[PDB]
Amino acid sequence: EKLNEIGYDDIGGCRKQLAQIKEMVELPLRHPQLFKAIGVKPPRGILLYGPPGTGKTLVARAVANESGSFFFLINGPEIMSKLAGESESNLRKAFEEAEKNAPAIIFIDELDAIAPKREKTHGEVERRIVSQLLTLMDGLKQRSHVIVMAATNRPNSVDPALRRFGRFDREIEIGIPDSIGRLEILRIHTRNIRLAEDVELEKIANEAHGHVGADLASLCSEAALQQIRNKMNLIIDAEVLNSLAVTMDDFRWALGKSNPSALRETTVEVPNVTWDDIGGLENVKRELQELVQYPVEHPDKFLKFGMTPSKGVLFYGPPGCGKTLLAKAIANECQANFISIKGPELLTMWFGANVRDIFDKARQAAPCVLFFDELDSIAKAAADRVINQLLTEMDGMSAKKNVFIIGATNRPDIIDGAILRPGRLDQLIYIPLPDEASRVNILKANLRKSPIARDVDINFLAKATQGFSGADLTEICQRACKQAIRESIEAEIRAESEKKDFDPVPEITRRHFEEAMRFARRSVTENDVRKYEMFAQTL
Amino acid sequence: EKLNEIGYDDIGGCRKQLAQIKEMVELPLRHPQLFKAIGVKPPRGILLYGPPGTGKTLVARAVANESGSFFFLINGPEIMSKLAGESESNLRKAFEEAEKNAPAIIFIDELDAIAPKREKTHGEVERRIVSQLLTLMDGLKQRSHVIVMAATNRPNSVDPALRRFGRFDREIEIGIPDSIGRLEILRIHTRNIRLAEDVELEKIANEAHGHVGADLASLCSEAALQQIRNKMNLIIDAEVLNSLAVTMDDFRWALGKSNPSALRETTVEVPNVTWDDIGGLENVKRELQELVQYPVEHPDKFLKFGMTPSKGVLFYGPPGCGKTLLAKAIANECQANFISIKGPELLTMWFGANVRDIFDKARQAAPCVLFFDELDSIAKAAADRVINQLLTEMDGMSAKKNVFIIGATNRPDIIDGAILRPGRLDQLIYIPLPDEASRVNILKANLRKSPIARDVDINFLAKATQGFSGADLTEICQRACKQAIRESIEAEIRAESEKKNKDFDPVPEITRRHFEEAMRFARRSVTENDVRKYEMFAQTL
Ligand SMILES: Cc1cc2c(C(N)=O)cccc2n1-c1nc2c(c(NCc3ccccc3)n1)COCC2
Ligand SMILES: Cc1cc2c(C(N)=O)cccc2n1-c1nc2c(c(NCc3ccccc3)n1)COCC2
């Protein structure tokens, strides 16, 4: 009987959308007088879409329960699992009961099942039920106090006729939870499971990438199974039963063996790469501040001076110089959402229309940076369709919506000149090989989690490199760590053999870094650097 | 019960169409004696089409109510939601009840639902309804005084059989409202909502691009919701309730977060770019006047001299010289509609016939200037299909309908010579880099909204920038504005630091210094070689 007690606190990583739906639904159903007085018309149909398992199904019940409304549930499979007349009778009865017991919420859990695309019907009963649903949606009066909520995997799966301005006009996306949402879901799912004192659910939430709420429930279940195995493979005994608590190692094992279902779905989040970490690149700092931070933080100045900000940059520069991190940092300084799209991903999804989906999602998000990772794959100069999609979508993106498109290219001389036209992406910014401070910061980011020895002078390594790209520094650090692991394992084997300095190699010593450096080679030739300098004028 | 009172004043941005429909429907059904005497036959079927949310659904009721006729409504979803026999029984009862209570209007709301394309039926019950609808539409007796009206998203969706000369012969398009129509919509949706005295609804309309009437209802709803947020967050005191009025800052917030449904719908409007703003380019003014204005303003002299005007023009010149604006300006001087089509758009829509749709809309519009920007992406010399469609449409377009096709190209040498034949696009006009007079207006147009300091000599900059293209001038001003914003934001930060230690506006205008810095890095974007190449094209062809 927990259904009647499902509240907002019992739903996981949809805090922003939960607040939005609260404002949309609860307030009109709790204080109709205010909205009627001012004139606001509460929404008729709210469609929720997103990856499966997010928890969008519980949102309608939570809203109804905490607003005191009546809740009638319409399950698409249930209505489509009945005869030709009984399904229509059930739809009509649901709407009639909702009208009788207003204020009320009708929840169509699988709207895609009831009303798929008209091309997929291939029947008369299905089209009849679709038309009946349309009529009932039109039947509901503006002042009946019945709010029809719906859930679907993808909004494009619903018949377009249902998305008219009178039937389903508001669409809210319940996407993949962030780390805070993941922690909330894990806390919700562990209220009954007994947890050991050594579990840090924050770390588990931060590590689980691509995990939706159902995936986290599976994670907790598998962790409990692992604990039972550990305490049962050796051993029924009441004392042992009371000593059964999920330890952190069990959670780590479950996470390692967990195959999340939302790894392939794009993430929208505010990156935590503060510009204090990027270090130098201060010319790029100033340019990106002028191009992104000022339009978002101080719209008043732009309105005062009557300048429409340009919403398009191109990050051209040698490979492995942290263009993605620069985009993330400029997103963070503005507290702007960040969306990262790789060329292979776009081509693969096109092979499997979705160019407009990502821009629509960017519009959904608050002021955001839409970072395309390799634009030569799309703008080579099959791809002739994606290029035009992108160009037209940029040509239709109003400059006042605060969506900044930042495309990165290692090879800028191949990009089609159409993209670089004024008003599309005409803000060429050059990202050079990291300077001294940038190199120190790269080496410190690489060695953040690695215990280094005090004798190691990171500043000396940065000074010595003087030309290495970022990937080169990462390779140097990885070589040093590999040699350290090689020494640790050799010492462990020697200790085992001698059985017939508890930790002989606890930190990476200066010798490891020296040996790694001896074989280091520059990856960006001076000719390449000269070539990238001339592109600013060759265009 | 407001349905019985829906008039013409309660519908939004369809002022032109409503007047057209008023003559078509209200006048015959009000004075049948006059039309019968001369011999006019009032229309049988009027198919209203356009993007969703325009307000075409209320037109039938407004026409019926004002003319006193009987209004019987038919809903596509409703009829197709019933059994095989009841759906047909309702169609026949709708027309049977209409003839009984004539004069009357039958409004089919979703004609695409009842009568989709014959290839989409894939059933027997559905195909019986289509045929039943056809029979009823052909059973009207031209004296029954019953007028059928229909609404559809696109006319091509309807079964072609319904669009014969006896069933649905008149099609009226209710499209995206223009700025005046947006204000009509923004004033009918605000009759009940209380508004603050600081609200200038005219400004919101001119900024609401791509907003259909339904979308403008979301703006008002969102704007009022914003006011509740502001007052509720500060907070149900009755005094506060009476002080709840939508302020303009709320509207601007709503407009920023509003995602209009019709941003991708093409616009038909008369541009406001008067030729007095284009400045010079006077050798282009004479040629454009001889080809667009005189045929439209003075048809008499063309008939008197027996000359058929050439309906095609090609604009070729260096990039960023305001070719589009010149096309807009001549349209304004003729009060002609202007349709701008981009090369990328035509290919994108073709991948997703539509060439014939652009021309058909041009024909429906009053004397029109159909601009084809980037005609080098279509006439490159997939695309082979689009060029032929464009090539055939021009040939099949009678020169007497006052529709002019202007094609702008930055690279004319690539254009296929088929388009440049004497039949369709036979006139070439060269738009050069802006001259001294024009460069003054380009700078003025850019700095129209920007408060400039009196020490700035706009004339001096134009004299200095002899050779700069239009985009080069625009870049200079933006750099001036960009730098001006920087000195304003840094001054604010310095003020904050000084405030902690203890000229209201530090930089109120773009000083002469800001322009000086921008000009130093400014570089010409059209090489002297490129200018020479364009000159030789007139003879190379
Ligand atoms: C771990 C790592 C690899 C890498 C690479 C690379 N091709 O291996 C390139 C650029 C930055 C890189 N970082 C890196 N990663 C981070 C930071 C940071 N700071 C310096 C920097 C940043 C952007 C840009 C330049 C230099 N650098 C600071 O934020 C945390 C992560
Ligand atoms: C804002 C703007 C940008 C721009 C560009 C450009 N490459 O961005 C090219 C030509 C004119 C341009 N304008 C512009 N825009 C306007 C005007 C005007 N001056 C006269 C003119 C027109 C076309 C041509 C020459 C000179 N210039 C005057 O009418 C109002 C709008």
Author numbering:
A (entry chain A): 193 to 427, 434 to 550, 554 to 582, 593 to 711, 720 to 758
B (entry chain F): 193 to 427, 434 to 550, 554 to 582, 593 to 713, 720 to 758
Wording from the paper:
As a proof-of-principle in the utility of our prioritization scheme, we conducted further studies with a schistosome protein encoding a putative valosin-containing protein/p97 (vcp/p97/cdc48) ortholog (Smp_018240). p97 is an abundant AAA-ATPase that serves a major part in the regulation of protein quality control, including mediating the degradation of ubiquitinated proteins via the endoplasmic reticulum associated degradation (ERAD) pathway. p97 is a pivotal constituent of the UPS that extracts and disassembles its substrates from various cellular compartments. To further our ability to conduct target-based drug discovery, we obtained a structure of S. mansoni p97 using cryo-EM.
Treatment with CB-5083, an ATP-competitive inhibitor, and NMS-873, an allosteric inhibitor, led to parasite death in vitro at submicromolar concentrations. This selectivity was minor for CB-5083 (~twofold), but more pronounced for ML240 (~fivefold). We found that the binding modes and conformational changes observed in S. mansoni p97 following binding to active site inhibitors (CB-5083) and nucleotide substrates (ATPγS) were similar to the human enzyme. Interestingly, Cys519 naturally occupies an inward (in) position in its apo-form, when bound to nucleotide substrate (ATPγS), or active site inhibitors (CB-5083).
